[PDB]
Design a protein around this ligand. Structure first.
Ligand SMILES: [Mg+2]
Ligand SMILES: [Mg+2]
Ligand SMILES: [Mg+2]
Ligand SMILES: [Mg+2]
Ligand SMILES: [Mg+2]
Ligand SMILES: [Mg+2]
Ligand SMILES: [Mg+2]
Ligand SMILES: [Mg+2]
Ligand SMILES: [Mg+2]
Ligand SMILES: [Mg+2]
Ligand SMILES: [Mg+2]
Ligand SMILES: [Mg+2]
Ligand SMILES: [Mg+2]
Ligand SMILES: [Mg+2]
Ligand SMILES: [Mg+2]
Ligand SMILES: [Mg+2]
Ligand SMILES: [Mg+2]
Ligand SMILES: [Mg+2]
Ligand SMILES: [Mg+2]
Ligand SMILES: [Mg+2]
Ligand SMILES: [Mg+2]
Ligand SMILES: [Mg+2]
Ligand SMILES: [Mg+2]
Ligand SMILES: [Mg+2]
Ligand SMILES: [Mg+2]
Ligand SMILES: [Mg+2]
Ligand SMILES: [Mg+2]
Ligand SMILES: [Mg+2]
Ligand SMILES: [Mg+2]
Ligand SMILES: [Mg+2]
Ligand SMILES: [Mg+2]
Ligand SMILES: [Mg+2]
Ligand SMILES: [Mg+2]
Ligand SMILES: [Mg+2]
Ligand SMILES: [Mg+2]
Ligand SMILES: [Mg+2]
Ligand SMILES: [Mg+2]
Ligand SMILES: [Mg+2]
Ligand SMILES: [Mg+2]
Ligand SMILES: [Mg+2]
Ligand SMILES: [Mg+2]
Ligand SMILES: [Mg+2]
Ligand SMILES: [Mg+2]
Ligand SMILES: [Mg+2]
Ligand SMILES: [Mg+2]
Ligand SMILES: [Mg+2]
Ligand SMILES: [Mg+2]
Lengths: 47, 110, 65, 72
RNA sequence: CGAGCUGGAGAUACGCUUUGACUCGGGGAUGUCCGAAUGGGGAAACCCACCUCGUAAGAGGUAUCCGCAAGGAUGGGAACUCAGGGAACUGAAACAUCUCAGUACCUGAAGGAGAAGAAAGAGAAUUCGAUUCCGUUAGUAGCGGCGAGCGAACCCGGAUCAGCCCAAUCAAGCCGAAGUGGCUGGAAAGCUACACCUCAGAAGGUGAGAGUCCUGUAGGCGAACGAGAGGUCGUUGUUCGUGAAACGAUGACUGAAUCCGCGCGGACCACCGCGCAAGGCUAAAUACUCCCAGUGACCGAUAGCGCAUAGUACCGUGAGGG
RNA sequence: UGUUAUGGCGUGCCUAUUGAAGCAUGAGCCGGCGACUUAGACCUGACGUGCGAGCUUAAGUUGAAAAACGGAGGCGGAGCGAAAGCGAGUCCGAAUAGGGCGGCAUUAGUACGUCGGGCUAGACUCGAAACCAGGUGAGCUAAGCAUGACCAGGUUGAAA
RNA sequence: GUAGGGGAGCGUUCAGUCCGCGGAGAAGCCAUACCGGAAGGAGUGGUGGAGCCGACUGAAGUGCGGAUGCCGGCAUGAGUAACGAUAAAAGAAGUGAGAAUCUUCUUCGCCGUAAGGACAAGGGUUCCUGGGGAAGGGUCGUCCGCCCAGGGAAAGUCGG
RNA sequence: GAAUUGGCUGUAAAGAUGCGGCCUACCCGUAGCAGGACGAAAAGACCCCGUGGAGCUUUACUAUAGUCUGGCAUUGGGAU
C-alpha cells in the first residue's frame, strides 16, 4: 500500500530548508541549536 | 604521542657527526651520521645493519631478493665522541669567531 | 538546612526547667453552660502531657521557646 | 502603547466571597485570583511636522494644558 | 633556531635548503560562493541585472533605520546579568486560597561582567552615613485554609571603597653541574666495586628501575615587531495571603504646597526624631566558564565526555535521537 | 585423589505468604555493569578526645612542599508567667490550696571526630497512566483553494 | 530461629608510612589431596612478560543469583521451518581450478491495453568497456543492479 | 530453573513425572496425533482495590473567554 514518505525535492527544500528555517525565530533557533550539536547536517539543503 | 615530544624535537647531534653507540647490542661501535630525524629521534649509523627482504615485486626484479642495509636507531643510544678521550662524551656550548656556537667536552672541541 | 520551629506549637506548648513539656487543658470555648463550674475552672488551666507525646513536641520547637 | 511612557502592563485580579460581616465576619475567603490587563485610548496631533500617533488620557489632559515637548 | 625539510599519510616520483630552508614568534597581501547578506530574485551556497572607471581583462558601487555630515546600528556568543511574559506536575497524604515558584520555558537588551549606587534611607543611640558580596543575627521577629509550610531586617564582624555634574611585567628562545669498570640479561638504568655535581634528587624518553646518557629542572640571559507628589477604585512588592495595612509601585479618574515649606517614621492625632522626591553617569569587591595552565586518597576502554574522538554510522518527513 | 556398582536416605532457588517441590512470581547460560548515599556548619543519643565553670570560633587576613591569626557571633551560666514584670523564686488567687522550679541527700559543660537515628533535599534502586511549557509535523490521512489530466465498448431512448 | 537490635571480624580499590619482592620474571590467568571458627589464606607447579605482596592507618563508586533488571558473548529449539506466486523446462557446445545456475546454438514454455514501448516524480553512475569474487545474491556462481579502474551525457529551435 | 521428565490410587495450598504405596517399563530415533506438561504469547482488558489517571456530562463547587449593565474618561455648544 501507499506509504508515508513520498519524496519531493521541492517539498523537502521548501519545508525543512535553510531559507525556510531562517524565515522564523524558531527555525533560526533550530539552526543555532544544531550548529551547537556539531551536526554535519545543519539542514536538508546540506544533503 | 611522538618520540620527539620528550626530547623537544631536538637532536643532540648533527648529521655527518661521528657517533659512539652508548646502549644495546652495538655498544661502542662508531660511525658517521648518515641520516638523522629530529621529530622521530631516529638516526642512522653505518654499524647497526640488518638483512631486509624485498618480497614479490617485479621491481626490483621479478624474483624476491634479499638485502643488507642499516636500520636507524633511537637518538638516546648515540653520542658525540671526543678525539682525546675517544669515548662517550657530553657537550658544552661555547663560542668562536665571528658568531659561531661550538661544542666542547671537558676538553674542547668537536 | 537549619531545622525550623513548628509555629503551631509556639502558643500551645511549654518547655520546662527539667526538660518536660506542658500544655493547657481543653474544652473551654462553647462547652460552657455545661458546665460544671469546677470543670470550667479545671479547664482554663495548664498541665503536663502524659509522656508518649513528649518527643514530638520537643522536635516541634528546637529552641525551647 | 502610550504617548509619554509605555503603558499596557498589569496586574492580576482577585475576588472574595463571604464578603464582610461584623467588621470581622469569620474572615474573608477568596475564590478568584486570575490575571487581567489595563489600557487607555487614541487621537491625532503633531511634532517636528506631521504625525498622528496614540495618546494616553493623562496625555490628552497634560497636552491640552501645554506641550510637554510635542504639539497639538 | 641552525640542519634538515617536502601536513595527519606511514606511499612512489619531483625536488627545496647554510645567500639560512622547515618549525616557532610578529605584523601585513591575497582571501572564490553562501550565511546579518546588503543590487534584484531565490528552494542557503544559485539565477538575472543597472551604474562609474577600464583598452578589454578587470575593479568598485547599487539594503534598511538614526543623523546635515562624519559615523553608528542589524548578526553571532555555553554559562553568568538585567528586563517584558510566565507554567504544571508536586506538597498540602483528597482540593480551590496556599505550595511548588517568580523556578522551567519563551522573548528582549548588553557586557566582559552585569546589576546597583551618592539617602524625601535605615533606624531609636537625638546612633549610622552610596551600592553589591561573604559571615552573623536566625529558623529569631513576623507570614499562614495560623494547616502544609514560608521566612526577614537592624546591630556586630569582614571583602572593596568614590563619589561628580545639571534645570531658574608577560608573548618566541638561548645558557645551563656531575661516572666509569666488572657481573646477570636479548637488552642496563638493575647488581657490584670505588667515583663525582647539587641554588639542579620535579618530570618524561632511553631494549628492566638512570641525580651525573638525552630532554630538562635550580639559576641566569632574552628581542626589532607584540602585549599590559497626594488621593480614590483595581492590584502588587518585601516576613506582607485585607489583616487595624502603613510604605513603595502603576492602569483608570483626579490633581497641592516651594523654606514659618515639603516627604517619612506600620491605621489615625499631637509631640519628639530622620530626611531635601519628581534630573543623569560612575571604577572597585560579586557571577559565570566556551577557551588556557596547574593540580587530584577522580576514571583507565560496559569506566571516564555521547566519542581514546563522531554528533559520524545509523534511526526519523522533521523537531530530534544516536 | 578420580571414577564407578549397589544399598539407605532425600519435595530446585528466590519472592510472596496463614501455608511453596507446588500445576503460584522471576529466571536460557556465563561474564561484566547493577541498589541505603551525599549535603547542612541543622536536630537528638552512644563512643572517644581536648580543654573545663567555662568551651568554641565563622566569614576573612596572612602564610602556604605547612599552618597561624581572626571573639563577630554561638553553647553553658535561672527559673516562672499569656505578658508586664517578678526573681530562687514564680503563676493562678484577696490570701489558701496547687503547677512549674531552685535547694535538692548529689550531680558540667563545650568544641571537635566516628557511629546510631531524625529533618530538609531526587534521599535504597528501577517502573507508570498522566500534567505543563516551547517547538516539529497536512511528502500518510481529513478537507479547502488555483490549475491540468482521465472514463473501451455496448444498452435505454426524456423534453423540445 | 523470620522481621529487628546488638557484637567480633573476612575481602576489594585508592591513600599515607613502614617492610620488601621482581627479567634467574611482577600483577592477572590455570591445577591442586595443605591452613584457619567462617568470610577466607598460603605451599608447589603451568601460564604470562612489567610491575607488585605483607603490616599499621585513612577515605570509598567496596562484595550479587535473582529485579519479565542493563551491555555482551554463546547455547536450545535443529541440521528442524523455510529458500518469496505452479509461466517449465531439455540437449548440445563453450569456458573455467571448480558449472543444474555464466556464454553460444537449437528447441520448448509464459506475457502480449502487457509481463511490450515512451515520458514525469523519484533515485544517483546503478549506463558502456575491461577486469574482480571476500562479503551482498535466500543454492551455486567463472555471473550480477556487487567490488576496482577508465570511458560515456554535447541544443539559438525540445523542458526550465 | 535445571532435568536421569511413566501408569494407577493416595497425600500434599484443595488438579503430582518429581511425595507415599502398588504396577509398568531394554538403549536411541523417523514419520505422524494433539490428552497432559494448570503448554506459548500479552505483569487479565471482567472484578475489586488506589483518598491513581483521563474523556464526557449536568439545575455538583469554584473561576473564567464572551456578554448584558450603572458610573468615570475620550466628551463639546445650544434651546425647552
Ligand atoms: Mg628546528
Ligand atoms: Mg543577495
Ligand atoms: Mg510579573
Ligand atoms: Mg493537580
Ligand atoms: Mg495534594
Ligand atoms: Mg543579542
Ligand atoms: Mg490599594
Ligand atoms: Mg501581595
Ligand atoms: Mg503610597
Ligand atoms: Mg580490557
Ligand atoms: Mg494466598
Ligand atoms: Mg510471615
Ligand atoms: Mg513445575
Ligand atoms: Mg514454579
Ligand atoms: Mg502474583
Ligand atoms: Mg517463563
Ligand atoms: Mg562525652
Ligand atoms: Mg557530635
Ligand atoms: Mg534513608
Ligand atoms: Mg542462635
Ligand atoms: Mg599501600
Ligand atoms: Mg594494582
Ligand atoms: Mg543474571
Ligand atoms: Mg518472556
Ligand atoms: Mg541479551
Ligand atoms: Mg535431515
Ligand atoms: Mg521438530
Ligand atoms: Mg520435517
Ligand atoms: Mg520443506
Ligand atoms: Mg524463487
Ligand atoms: Mg517447481
Ligand atoms: Mg579447457
Ligand atoms: Mg533457473
Ligand atoms: Mg555452437
Ligand atoms: Mg512495461
Ligand atoms: Mg542527472
Ligand atoms: Mg552464495
Ligand atoms: Mg577466471
Ligand atoms: Mg552492467
Ligand atoms: Mg542545428
Ligand atoms: Mg528415563
Ligand atoms: Mg484429600
Ligand atoms: Mg509417583
Ligand atoms: Mg525424588
Ligand atoms: Mg499440528
Ligand atoms: Mg495484573
Ligand atoms: Mg467580563
Amino acid at each position: 500500500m501507499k506509504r508515508t514518505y513520498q519524496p519531493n525535492n521541492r517539498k523537502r527544500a521548501k519545508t525543512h530548508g535553510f531559507r525556510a528555517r531562517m524565515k522564523t525565530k524558531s527555525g533560526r533557533n533550530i539552526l543555532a541549536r544544531r550548529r551547537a550539536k556539531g551536526r554535519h547536517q545543519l539542514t536538508v539543503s546540506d544533503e | 604521542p611522538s618520540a620527539g615530544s620528550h626530547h623537544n624535537d631536538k637532536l643532540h647531534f648533527k648529521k655527518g657527526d661521528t657517533v659512539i653507540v652508548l646502549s644495546g647490542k652495538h655498544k661502542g661501535q662508531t660511525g658517521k651520521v648518515l641520516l638523522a630525524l629530529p621529530r622521530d629521534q631516529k638516526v642512522v649509523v653505518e654499524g647497526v645493519n640488518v638483512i631486509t627482504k624485498n618480497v614479490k615485486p617485479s621491481m626490483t626484479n621479478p624474483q624476491g631478493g634479499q638485502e643488507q642495509r642499516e636500520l636507524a636507531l633511537h637518538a638516546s643510544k648515540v653520542a658525540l665522541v671526543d678525539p682525546e678521550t675517544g669515548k662517550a662524551t657530553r657537550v658544552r656550548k661555547q663560542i668562536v669567531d665571528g658568531k659561531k656556537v661550538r661544542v666542547a667536552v671537558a676538553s674542547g672541541k668537536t | 538546612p537549619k531545622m525550623k520551629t513548628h509555629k503551631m506549637a509556639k502558643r500551645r506548648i511549654k518547655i520546662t526547667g527539667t526538660g518536660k513539656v506542658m500544655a493547657f487543658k481543653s474544652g473551654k470555648r462553647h462547652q460552657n453552660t455545661g458546665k460544671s463550674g469546677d470543670e470550667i475552672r479545671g479547664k482554663g488551666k495548664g498541665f503536663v502531657l502524659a509522656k508518649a507525646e513528649w518527643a514530638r513536641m520537643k522536635l516541634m520547637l528546637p529552641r525551647g521557646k | 502603547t502610550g504617548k509619554k511612557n509605555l503603558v499596557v502592563n498589569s496586574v492580576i485580579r482577585r475576588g472574595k466571597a463571604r464578603a464582610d460581616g461584623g467588621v470581622g465576619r469569620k474572615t474573608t475567603g477568596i475564590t478568584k485570583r486570575v490575571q487581567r490587563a489595563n489600557l487607555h485610548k487614541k487621537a491625532i496631533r503633531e511634532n517636528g511636522q506631521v504625525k498622528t500617533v496614540w495618546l494616553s488620557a493623562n496625555a490628552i489632559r497634560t497636552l491640552s494644558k501645554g506641550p510637554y515637548k510635542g504639539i497639538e
